[PDB]
Design a protein around this ligand. Structure first.
Ligand SMILES: *C(=O)CCCCCCCCCCCCC
Lengths: 1284, 41
């Protein structure tokens, strides 16, 4: 429950016993006073500053707390320096006065009288004669402590200790004295409570109860009279606060009378907080109590409100907000603020003037006398128990949402949100992309097919537009920062076009390089000269150019240049309003392809490869160079591609090939994907509205009373909010203002929630227990569209199906769909049109209150589908087993093929037309991922994260025929995460970072686990080769009754073959399509040049395109044979012997060594893949280092090289070095040292150059060393022993 | 039958409870609530 602004945790907890009041003996009082250091023993600096012996306030204990200074001490306060000195003096000098009147030795075993001792000591400090107090400085425990003060003498004159027959009127102590330099201004200084003052109270001690009536009666005019009912300190006192009110705690001056209440009530609360059973406290409660001039009815004055809350604080109730051990003004004020805030004055325990009603069923055990009545309210909501304190959360903690039973009505659960939501919420964007590049090479000179340069995919219209550009730009900045990547990317590739041989060198060691464009000098320059980029030799000299070179002359590549040629003329200038821009580019390339040495390598960078420029380029420079590859390094969303020219020889023939059409086409196909994706993101610096798709919407509540079983606003707003952001995050925080305690509860409202929330018919409640439990302050909210780290390669794949199932389920005729093994909480409800009737099922119970969704539209079945029983009475025309099918085979400990062998037939019986199952079979390759998936071959099984989970798999072919035998008439097809990254509005759409380099990983993780899409509703394909080999003509036959259809097979999310029988444009190879009337099926005579998964599409003139199955041209047989040369005819001389390597032309091989986890391209002079049109050869130069370090021919792809084929050359690794010939001793690698030892004798050292080389040793002509940045000494003849 | 305490005004294992049918009060609730068209309105 909650009393006014304060919230009280359910559990009641109070100390269960009271320590018998013990009066200090006379000796102990003598030691306490005469101790080395009084600090701690008598007084205690509340906030003593380490740096300097300074203390703003000092809270004091017993023989000192009684004392109340005279005016001269208040005005001109002392510093913590002379203060310790003042007391360390007076405390001692006082012991004298008192001990000389009572020799300790004889009377130490006599209890001093708490009261008199106080006044007797306080009066001593003020320097008042202390004669009278001594007379009775002791008293026998039997006679009351306050009675001895009266019995000994009824002396009604000594100021500050008027003893009458029944009462002793003395000025309250000063539990706080303030040393000069104190100010209630700072929020940090400890809450003094006005007691730093001398006369803020007037403790009236009384002898008997009738003695007390006579007191109250007489002081009934005074503002109010607080009195401690629970075991008063030295005997029943009767505190009377002076009329004045303290400054600081509330903007509205709080009366000294009411402040004392807060300060105490704030104890009974903080004390209940940690009071335990095992401990025995003085008082079962510390709360004060008003006995006079107090208005019992109203609840305005801070006092009335506080009082009202103390009658409750005596039950053991504890404040949810932890009350500090040493209340500080900032804190006290944050409590006195919470108290003032409009609320409901607790009503369980009515107020009395002489009795505190305490719950019988409560921890609190009444003292004795007549002050505690065991009143029992009709229905107290609190039960007992305590709470262990938990430290403040360092960051906003996310809260999984678990639902309750009652659900709010959309209408009410809306404004509820809109009454406390942070609408125009300012939010940071952060960075959505942080990864490297997603480079993609394309050989234009490679493809042997001519493709009319007039009809390429010309720049898409929309491209240049306020809306599109705005986004293309926005995405750009949303990338945590670029040439360092791009530039390096192009060189990672350029390193493959390097030919070391004399026959026809290309980028041969020490080649000169021209460079245009710099900001200081390009960061890549340092690396080229360092030979840092593996595979590429160190150029002799680099000549910079451009518009801001700062190290070379400034040239304008548009017009002519006055410089000489270069082996490599890497051009990176920008083109930017389209025709003259084309001229700009066509011109630039013209001069860049001019500055290159004859037989060089020009590397221009076009900004808009328009089919307008692709005619001018293939026309003007149709000769200039030999080869040509497009190297689009996608760092951000732009269409600027890089073109590299082979041999800058005058009589070349760079014809536009189908490669270009495909390359160019893939590029755009992705900008539509990347753009459509970015649409879901708000423009920087714009206040958050409801418009933005990815907008972060929160709900800040103030001291919200989340209650179970009640639709109170605070708990009502919680509903909507979580409903508006389910699949997301939902992070709740609690920052403590010196006023109330705000608690925002944001979440990244995406389009994945709008889809889900729409399907909701009602907004369910959330078990507020977890929230009610917190009670600790976390850090302030953040509101940031994106998280900070790039999602796991696994998610890039998962969010690759949530886009796929989304597009499949979006189909109308689909009707009723079920999900075999949806998550514990239906995650598929977001990926389905709010109208389709789906029925998710899972062994575990559904996480979302299935009741809130319309029964007709959403159904939920428990138990597994692996068991035959479950399938009774569940009929859906389409099933989807994504993310489960793999776990079921493992759970049911069964074979993968055998499993689906029993599931598919059940879906057929279940009445299913369509099927989608995230099966995990290696259709592309049996190759695995190092950290993501291990493919144990002894037993068909996977190891996602090697161990984390193990699930059996099937093979592309066996599983393919097994399912075709199950559903013979059904058409099968494999959909897999397409390189176009069109699924993006699911990663960048939900607000998650990523690595443009991982897209490659996931498109490779998607290949390890495709989604076999079956369709009983159509005839399946017919591939004549079956395990279709790349580069072989195959027969494919789509059986469609109407010849008037358009065949359009598309692979990778890009169409490649389209056209009615007569004409068929094919970029995948020679495709001759012709509808045969007889069989009524278009027989496609197709021969592919690219392996993959082609999804055949046969679309009728009218109506949407319809899929008719999917065949898969499998990559060629990866293997490597080398015509290794014989020991003789093979030399260790400079001219490197070369064994012709036999490998499919398809795979590009590159020599390298396996250093660490990756492959590092060996330097071209040591080894290389010199390729003649007739054959690819392995050129190598024998070095003594060859026996220790071995080389590997590796599959060079845009990805890390050498994954498909990484075979190690074990021959060049064993070639035994003779005694009759010179041999080259190089260095093993960039980080390794060596030394030669002929015949077991330290002959020489490669690591350290011998000041003077040994007889017959010199540097080689080349730098054959694998590292390319090391010398390579040639020895005479002998028996050297390389020792790395 | 473990003690509860306040959730509900009566403990089951509470002090002096008493099962004891009386032909007089046939236990219960409300099953025959009328809702038919004409009768509900
Ligand atoms: C504790 O739960 C021990 C079991 C005693 C009661 C369990 C239920 C059987 C008696 C029913 C009492 C309420 C109405 C039948």
């Amino acid at each position: 429950a909650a009393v006014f602004g304060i919230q009280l945790v359910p559990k009641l907890n109070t100390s269960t016993t009271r320590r018998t009041f013990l009066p200090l003996r006379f000796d102990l009082l003598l030691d306490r006073l005469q101790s080395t250091n009084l600090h701690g023993v008598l007084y205690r600096a509340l906030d003593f500053n380490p740096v300097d012996r300074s203390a703003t306030v000092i809270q004091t204990y017993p023989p000192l707390n009684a004392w109340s200074p005279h005016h001269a001490f208040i005005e001109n306060p002392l510093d913590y320096r002379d203060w310790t000195e003042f007391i360390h003096d007076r405390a001692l000098a006082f012991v004298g006065v008192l001990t000389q009147r009572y020799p300790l030795t004889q009377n130490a075993q006599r209890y001093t009288n708490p009261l008199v001792l106080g006044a007797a000591f306080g009066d001593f400090l003020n320097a008042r004669s202390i004669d009278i107090f001594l007379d009775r400085l002791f008293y026998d425990p039997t006679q009351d402590s306050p009675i001895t003060a009266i019995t000994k003498f009824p002396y009604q004159w000594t100021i500050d200790s008027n003893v009458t027959t029944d009462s002793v009127r003395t000025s309250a102590g000063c539990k706080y004295i303030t040393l000069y330099g104190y100010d209630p201004s700072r929020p940090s200084t400890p809450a003094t409570y006005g007691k730093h003052r001398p006369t803020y109270a007037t403790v009236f001690y009384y002898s008997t109860l009738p003695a007390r009536s006579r007191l109250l009666a007489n002081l009934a005019a005074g503002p109010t009279v607080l009195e401690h009912f629970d075991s008063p300190t030295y005997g029943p006192h009767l505190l009377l606060p002076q009329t004045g009110d303290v400054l600081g705690y509330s903007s509205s001056l709080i009366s000294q009378a009411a402040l004392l209440m807060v300060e105490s009530v704030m104890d009974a609360l903080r004390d209940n907080a940690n009071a335990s059973a095992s401990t025995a406290v003085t008082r079962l409660d510390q709360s004060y109590h008003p006995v006079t001039s107090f208005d019992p009815s109203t609840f305005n004055t801070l006092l009335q409100r506080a009082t009202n809350l103390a009658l409750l604080a005596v039950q053991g109730v504890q404040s949810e907000s932890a009350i500090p051990a040493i209340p500080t003004m900032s804190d006290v004020r944050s409590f006195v603020a919470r108290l003032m805030a409009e609320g409901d004055p607790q009503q369980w325990f009515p107020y009395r003037v002489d009795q505190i009603l305490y719950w019988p069923e409560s921890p609190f055990v009444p003292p004795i006398g007549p002050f505690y009545a065991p009143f029992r309210p009709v229905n107290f909501p609190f039960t007992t128990g305590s709470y262990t304190v938990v430290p403040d959360a360092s960051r906003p903690l996310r809260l999984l949402p678990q639902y309750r039973n009652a659900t709010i009505t959309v209408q009410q659960a809306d404004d509820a949100y809109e009454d406390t939501a942070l609408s125009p919420l300012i939010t940071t964007h952060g960075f959505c992309v942080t990864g490297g590049v997603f480079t993609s090479i394309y050989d234009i000179s490679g493809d042997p097919t001519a493709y009319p340069p007039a009809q390429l995919v010309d720049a898409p219209n929309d491209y240049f537009d306020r809306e599109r550009m705005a986004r293309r730009d926005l995405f750009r900045r949303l990338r945590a920062p670029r040439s360092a990547i791009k530039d390096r990317a192009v060189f990672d590739f350029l390193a493959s076009l390097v030919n070391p041989t004399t026959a026809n060198p290309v980028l041969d060691t020490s080649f000169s390089m021209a460079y245009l464009g710099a900001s200081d000098e390009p960061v890549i320059l340092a690396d080229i000269r360092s030979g840092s980029i593996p595979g590429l030799p160190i150029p002799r000299r680099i000549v910079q150019f451009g518009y801001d070179v700062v190290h070379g002359s400034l040239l304008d590549l548009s017009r002519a240049v006055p410089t000489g040629t270069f082996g490599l003329v890497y051009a990176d200038l920008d083109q930017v309003d389209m025709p003259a821009a084309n001229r700009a580019a066509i011109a630039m390339l013209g001069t860049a392809l001019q500055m290159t040495t004859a037989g060089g390598v020009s590397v221009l960078k076009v900004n808009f490869p328009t089919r307008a420029f692709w005619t001018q380029v293939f026309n003007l420079y149709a000769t200039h160079a030999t080869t040509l590859h497009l190297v689009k390094p996608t760092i951000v969303n732009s269409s600027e591609v890089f073109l590299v020219f082979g041999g800058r020889q005058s009589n070349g023939a760079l014809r536009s090939t189908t490669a270009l059409q495909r390359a160019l086409l893939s590029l755009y196909a992705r900008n539509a994907a990347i753009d459509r994706a970015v649409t879901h993101i708000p423009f920087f610096g714009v206040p958050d509205d409801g418009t933005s798709d990815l907008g972060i919407d929160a709900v800040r509540l103030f001291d919200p009373m989340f209650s179970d079983a009640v639709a109170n606003l605070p708990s009502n707003a919680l509903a909507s909010l979580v409903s508006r952001v389910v699949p997301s995050s939902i992070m709740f925080t609690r920052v403590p203002s010196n006023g109330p305690v705000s608690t925002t509860i944001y979440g990244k409202r995406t389009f994945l929630s709008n889809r889900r929330r729409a399907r909701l018919r009602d907004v369910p409640m959330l078990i507020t227990t977890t929230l009610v439990h917190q009670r600790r302050f976390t850090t302030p909210p953040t509101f940031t569209l994106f998280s900070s780290e790039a999602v796991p390669v696994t998610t890039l794949v998962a969010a690759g199906y949530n886009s796929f199932i989304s597009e499949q389920t979006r189909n109308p005729n689909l009707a009723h769909l079920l999900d075999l093994g949806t998550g514990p909480e239906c995650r598929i409800l977001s990926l389905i049109p709010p109208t389709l009737q789906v029925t998710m099922s899972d062994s575990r119970p559904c996480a979302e209150l299935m009741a809130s969704f319309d029964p007709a539209l959403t159904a939920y079945v428990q138990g597994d589908y692996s068991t035959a029983a479950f399938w009774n009475g569940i009929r859906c025309d389409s099933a989807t087993a994504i993310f489960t099918i793999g776990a079921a085979a493992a759970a049911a400990g069964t074979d993968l093929i055998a499993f689906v062998q029993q599931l598919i037939p059940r879906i057929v019986a279940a009445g299913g037309t369509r099927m989608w199952l995230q099966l995990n079979t290696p259709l592309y390759e049996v190759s695995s991922l190092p950290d993501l998936i291990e493919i144990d071959l002894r037993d068909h099984v996977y190891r996602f994260n090697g161990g984390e989970r193990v699930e059996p798999y099937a093979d592309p072919v066996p599983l393919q025929q097994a399912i075709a035998a199950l559903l013979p008439a059904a058409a099968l097809s494999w959909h897999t995460l397409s390189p176009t990254c069109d699924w993006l509005p699911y990663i960048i759409g939900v607000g998650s970072p990523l690595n443009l380099s991982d897209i490659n990983t996931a498109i490779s993780y998607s290949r390890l686990t495709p989604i076999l899409h079956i369709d009983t509703t159509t005839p399946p394909l017919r591939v004549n080769p079956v395990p279709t080999p790349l580069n072989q003509q195959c027969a494919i036959r789509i059986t469609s009754l109407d010849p008037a259809a358009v065949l359009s097979v598309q692979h990778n999310g890009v169409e490649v073959i389209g056209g009615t029988p007569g004409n068929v444009i094919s970029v995948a190879g020679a495709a001759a399509l012709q509808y045969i009337l007889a069989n009524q099926e278009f027989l496609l005579q197709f021969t592919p040049t690219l392996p993959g998964i082609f999804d055949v599409f046969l679309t009728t003139l009218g109506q949407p395109p319809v899929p008719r199955g999917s065949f898969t041209i499998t990559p060629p047989p990866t293997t490597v044979a080398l015509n290794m040369p014989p020991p003789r005819q093979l030399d260790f001389t400079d001219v490197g012997n070369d064994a012709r390597i036999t490998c499919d032309p398809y795979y590009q091989l590159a020599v390298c060594i396996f250093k660490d986890g990756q492959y590092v391209r060996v330097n071209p002079e040591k080894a290389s893949v010199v390729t003649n049109a007739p054959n690819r050869d392995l050129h190598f130069v024998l070095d003594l280092a060859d026996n220790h370090v071995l080389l590997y021919l590796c599959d060079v792809t845009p990805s890390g090289l050498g994954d498909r084929i990484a075979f190690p050359i074990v021959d060049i690794y064993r070639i035994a070095f003779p005694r009759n010939t010179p041999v080259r001793a190089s260095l093993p690698y960039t980080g390794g040292g060596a030394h030669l030892t002929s015949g077991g004798n330290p002959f020489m050292s490669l690591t350290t150059p011998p000041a003077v080389l040994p007889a017959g040793v010199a540097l080689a002509a080349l730098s054959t060393s694998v590292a390319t940045q090391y010398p390579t000494y040639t020895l005479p003849a002998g028996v050297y022993e390389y020792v790395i | 039958g473990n003690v509860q305490t306040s959730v509900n005004t009566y403990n089951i294992t509470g002090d002096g409870n008493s099962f004891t049918p009386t032909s007089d009060m046939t236990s219960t609730a409300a099953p025959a609530i009328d809702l038919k068209p004409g009768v509900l309105n």
